[PDB]
């Protein structure tokens, strides 16, 4: 069952997770369980930091500041930004940029 | 070297040198206004084999900064290195700068080796315990553990090891405010350094060589344009008659017989006139135990053409007068029955007073022919039993080149 | 037997750093040091290899250090412009000029998306 979920990761996640998943799958079940218990937390630093960095580099003042602050924070803050915080910042940036 | 930073004008004779853009870096210190002393290994392709570091120009452009205790300011002097003169036996090289630095004094050299237990200090621009490259130079403290064949073994006191970039750095010992250079850092355990770790603080340094430096720094005092003011005497209590001569600087320099150079008017005559054991140089300059002449005094209370030395009853001068007569002085005596005097020279124990005829013939007086040919016409101020300034003003001995080239 | 105390400008302790942080260092002019990231940050580099990130401290200007960090993506600057050289997987190198007191990215988080390597970190001066 763990191989199936990991197999999905290998085809849906970022490059960091995909490389980790397309390794753990062909591995003793005991280690695969560990991967799907805590090992799969590593992408929070590998893929999420890249994604937020891209948003900062090509974004306006609103996104740049909000993203930058999350980037220097913890995993929960980065995850939140890339889920809802990014949209709030982008809309507000557009609002003031247009006005 | 791990210790307090220092920018005081006691150790401002130190230097930092770099070879190439970033190829190598090490430390050094001044011995003259034109010369800087460092390790030979800095200029080697393999620093552990400083045998191929030949004399001549640096393989790569080399620069040195002198007196710049603090690298963030322009204070100090910058000079290019033009020539290297390696030590024939050990890891030590003298670097010649293109231009002198007259503002910063050199450090005096030690006369002997420090013994075990002696508290020595050291300064350099090498690594510290927490910095790869320092902003300011630092001073440490070391003690002698032993002395070996041309080298001194030291250890750090309370830590403070010799590290990296300290190669070429001086080892110093002072007394009553006077600093002497006792050796130069070569190798170390490098304990307590940034980026590395080991317990040992031991290090080895080359022993300072005063004679090596003297014969390099003063290597060219003569051999060029010299005056005819030359005289012979024993100035080093060696039993070998030395030669003193006046250079274009108006000073009298002593060259020791083995001619090796020492460290320190119409006609000049020498000899031990008062039998004091120290050769002297109408006023008499008395010799001293240090090889330095004292203040002269009149030997008496202008129509003489030449005056040269002559030993009378074991102790004297002979003067050739414009009337052709020659007299000896202690009380004076007639040296020759008539006015038959010819270029006057000094004496030598051939078996005797030497002389040169206007026809170029050389002879001696007990006259008898002294030289097979007649080529002494252009010779001046002949001194003494071996015996001219030469047509090139280069002293020859009878004609071996006693002077270096 | 003791080594010669001669500076070859090879980064001190580089062998240990490779083992512990995953980053490797070569030669520099000695005015940049690797340090911890705890309120002492000056120039900070982020990657997805080794111990995730690390900081460097500028002692004097100008300064440079030819360090190598695979899969780099982000750089932080402070009180100074930073000139950075990166290289692609095909061996082609390019230079990115980062402004002071801001954050920029590289290939991976840049315009190409390429997994580039950090080649040269140079401090203006």
Residue numbers in the entry:
A (entry chain A): 99 to 197
B (entry chain C): 30 to 287, 292 to 297, 307 to 323, 332 to 351, 356 to 369, 371 to 385, 395 to 405, 408 to 417, ...
C (entry chain B): 42 to 166
Reproduce text from the manuscript describing this model.
Here we show that in addition to small-molecule antibiotics, Streptomyces produce and secrete antibacterial protein complexes that feature a large, degenerate repeat-containing polymorphic toxin protein. A cryo-electron microscopy structure of these particles reveals an extended stalk topped by a ringed crown comprising the toxin repeats scaffolding five lectin-tipped spokes, which led us to name them umbrella particles. Streptomyces coelicolor encodes three umbrella particles with distinct toxin and lectin composition. Each contains an amino-terminal twin arginine translocation (TAT) signal, two sets of four ALF repeats (ALF1–ALF8), two extended coiled-coil domains, and variable C-terminal and toxin domains.
This process supported model building and provided a blueprint of the interactions underlying particle assembly. In line with our finding that UmbB1 interacts with individual ALF repeats, we were able to confidently model UmbB1 protomers in complex with ALF repeats at the base of each spoke. In spite of substantial variability in their sequences, ALF repeats bound UmbB1 at a stereotyped location, with residues in two of its short helical segments providing many key contacts. At several positions within this region that are highly conserved across each UmbB1-binding ALF repeat, ALF6 harboured dissimilar amino acids. IP experiments demonstrated that this substitution abolished ALF2 binding to UmbB1. Owing to the conserved UmbA trypsin-like domain engagement by the N terminus of UmbB1, these configurations are anticipated to share similar overall structures. Finally, the Umb1 structure highlighted UmbB as a remarkable adaptor protein and keystone component of Umb toxin particles. That is, it interacts with five sequence divergent ALF repeats on one face and four different UmbA proteins on another.
